Amino acid sequence: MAVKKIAIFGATGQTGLTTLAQAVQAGYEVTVLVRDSSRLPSEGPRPAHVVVGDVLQAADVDKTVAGQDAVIVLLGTRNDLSPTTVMSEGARNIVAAMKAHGVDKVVACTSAFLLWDPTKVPPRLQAVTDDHIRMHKVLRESGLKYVAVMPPHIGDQPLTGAYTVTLDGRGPSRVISKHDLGHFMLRCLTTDEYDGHSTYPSHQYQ
Amino acid sequence: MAVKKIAIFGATGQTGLTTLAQAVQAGYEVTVLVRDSSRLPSEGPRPAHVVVGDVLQAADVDKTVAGQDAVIVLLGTRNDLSPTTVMSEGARNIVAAMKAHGVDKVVACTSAFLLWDPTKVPPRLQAVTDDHIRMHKVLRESGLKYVAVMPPHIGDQPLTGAYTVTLDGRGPSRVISKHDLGHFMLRCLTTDEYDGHSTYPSHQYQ
Numbered sequence: 001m002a003v004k005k006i007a008i009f010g011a012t013g014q015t016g017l018t019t020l021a022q023a024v025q026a027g028y029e030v031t032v033l034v035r036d037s038s039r040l041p042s043e044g045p046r047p048a049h050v051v052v053g054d055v056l057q058a059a060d061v062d063k064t065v066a067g068q069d070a071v072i073v074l075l076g077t078r079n080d081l082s083p084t085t086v087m088s089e090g091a092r093n094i095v096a097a098m099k100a101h102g103v104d105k106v107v108a109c110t111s112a113f114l115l116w117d118p119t120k121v122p123p124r125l126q127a128v129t130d131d132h133i134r135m136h137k138v139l140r141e142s143g144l145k146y147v148a149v150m151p152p153h154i155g156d157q158p159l160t161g162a163y164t165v166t167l168d169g170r171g172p173s174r175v176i177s178k179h180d181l182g183h184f185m186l187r188c189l190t191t192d193e194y195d196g197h198s199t200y201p202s203h204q205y206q
Numbered sequence: 207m208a209v210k211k212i213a214i215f216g217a218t219g220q221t222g223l224t225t226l227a228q229a230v231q232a233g234y235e236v237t238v239l240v241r242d243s244s245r246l247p248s249e250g251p252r253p254a255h256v257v258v259g260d261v262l263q264a265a266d267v268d269k270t271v272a273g274q275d276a277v278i279v280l281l282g283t284r285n286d287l288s289p290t291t292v293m294s295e296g297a298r299n300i301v302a303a304m305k306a307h308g309v310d311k312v313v314a315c316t317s318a319f320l321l322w323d324p325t326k327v328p329p330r331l332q333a334v335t336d337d338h339i340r341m342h343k344v345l346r347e348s349g350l351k352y353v354a355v356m357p358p359h360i361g362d363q364p365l366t367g368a369y370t371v372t373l374d375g376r377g378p379s380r381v382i383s384k385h386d387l388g389h390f391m392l393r394c395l396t397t398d399e400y401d402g403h404s405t406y407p408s409h410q411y412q
């Protein structure tokens with residue numbers, strides 16, 4: 001089940017950047033889909049392959065997923081306060097391409113709001129949560145090996161590797177470092193214990 | 207006074223009103239952003255400039271921050287404990303305005319709960335705290351000269367100017383008077399020793 005080639009979607013984001021950096025240092029052959037190349041830092045850890053394109057364009061997604069061993073999805077639309085379907089339409093383009101190229105493993109990040117009561121969502125975050133739910137459906141109904149990662153507040157604490165993962169629930173803390181989050185994303189490429197589960201990562205920092 | 211023009215956000219609120227009163231008394235030229243339905247009281251001290259608008263509108267925050275030397279943030283939700291992003295989104299707008307207009311100094315109020323063990327946050331206060339956490343992260347990673355003011359319970363005790371300021375930890379009492387809290391927000395304008403630090407003002411009133 002060895003995973004060497006991965007595609008990262010959302011590589012230029014807050015979590016994406018440290019996931020990409022960790023993935024490149026751990027030996028992964030990384031393909032990233034970016035809309036603008038000047039957002040990848042020109043120093044240190046760089047991906048092996050850059051596809052310049054858009055996750056809503058099925059051609060770009062197919063070019064990105066071709067010949068991978070697994071996909072990591074760290075898509076976000078931080079700015080959208082009103083109904084939005086970019087992530088879920090991106091998931092559809094990813095699901096379809098995974099199927100046409102025979103890639104069976106996807107690890108995708110939504111949010112811990114999908115595990116807590118709906119009344120916990122702040123009004124201005126309801127649209128992205130609604131599309132998070134829509135993307136979770138696309139991936140769950142796809143048949144693929146899909147690890148759902150639903151993190152709480154994403155912090156800037158240093159990497160620890162010591163976080164807890166509670167399977168289909170909510171655990172001790174309400175924070176995961178972006179570094180620890182990307183670590184867990186990459187850890188999910190090395191096991192099947194989270195396949196078809198919802199994972200909540202959190203850790204007590206200092 | 208090097209600092210003489212300041213914007214106060216949340217000047218109509220419980221701490222903001224006494225902070226506005228002390229700032230005018232101390233000779234500051236104060237600009238306030240007020241929501242249309244909630245103007246400052248009739249008999250109260252008059253600021254030098256009033257912008258009517260909303261902290262969620264980037265245009266109104268830009269109008270308020272332009273031409274200022276420094277910014278004080280005392281936004282809140284009154285006694286409304288509902289999930290919100292008004293403080294974090296507003297801080298996002300304040301951060302953008304300050305960078306555009308060349309304002310560096312922002313003194314912003316979140317809460318002592320960002321210094322304490324997260325397991326101790328009372329569940330009734332977690333939603334508002336989750337936004338203080340979002341707001342603090344916005345301001346922390348802004349790169350601006352940001353004083354994180356993290357008070358415990360806000361009381362109605364007198365202005366003393368004799369409170370303790372604890373750096374990057376919990377202090378010796380669990381209360382600060384709204385008047386002392388506002389005194390400290392203004393004290394932070396006259397010194398750079400707290401820039402980049404978290405600050406916990408507390409006092410014993412007797």
Ligand SMILES: NC(=O)c1ccc[n+]([C@@H]2O[C@H](COP(=O)([O-])OP(=O)(O)OC[C@H]3O[C@@H](n4cnc5c(N)ncnc54)[C@H](OP(=O)(O)O)[C@@H]3O)[C@@H](O)[C@H]2O)c1
Binds near residue numbers: 128
């Ligand atoms: N902030 C939190 O505390 C928190 C908590 C729980 C869950 N989450 C969720 O976790 C996920 C990742 O979080 P994050 O903050 O790391 O994301 P982020 O910083 O907002 O980055 C979003 C990524 O998705 C890319 N993207 C957006 N639309 C795209 C499109 N049409 N085509 C290609 N790429 C696109 C972005 O590319 P560009 O650089 O071009 O924009 C970027 O790389 C998000 O969905 C977020 O809602 C966040």
Ligand SMILES: NC(=O)c1ccc[n+]([C@@H]2O[C@H](COP(=O)([O-])OP(=O)(O)OC[C@H]3O[C@@H](n4cnc5c(N)ncnc54)[C@H](OP(=O)(O)O)[C@@H]3O)[C@@H](O)[C@H]2O)c1
Binds near residue numbers: 220281285315334361
């Ligand atoms: N024991 C405590 O009370 C305590 C302890 C620790 C920390 N804190 C936190 O300290 C901060 C200040 O506390 P406080 O009691 O002085 O505040 P407050 O009385 O709740 O006042 C909130 C201020 O922010 C304004 N505001 C709210 N939404 C706005 C919007 N969209 N646009 C523009 N202005 C808006 C409000 O204006 P309007 O008049 O229009 O409403 C008001 O002036 C709060 O964030 C609070 O959560 C409180």
Ligand SMILES: Cc1c(Nc2ncccc2C(=O)O)cccc1C(F)(F)F
Binds near residue numbers: 079111112152153154
């Ligand atoms: C901030 C955020 C979140 N945040 C959370 N999600 C789950 C649990 C806790 C939180 C939190 O913020 O504490 C979720 C989706 C999108 C967004 C963003 F960046 F777009 F605004």
Ligand SMILES: Cc1c(Nc2ncccc2C(=O)O)cccc1C(F)(F)F
Binds near residue numbers: 283285334359
């Ligand atoms: C009361 C409150 C607090 N309270 C505290 N915060 C920090 C430390 C101690 C306390 C306390 O009151 O014991 C925090 C945020 C918002 C709110 C409010 F007014 F909106 F309800």
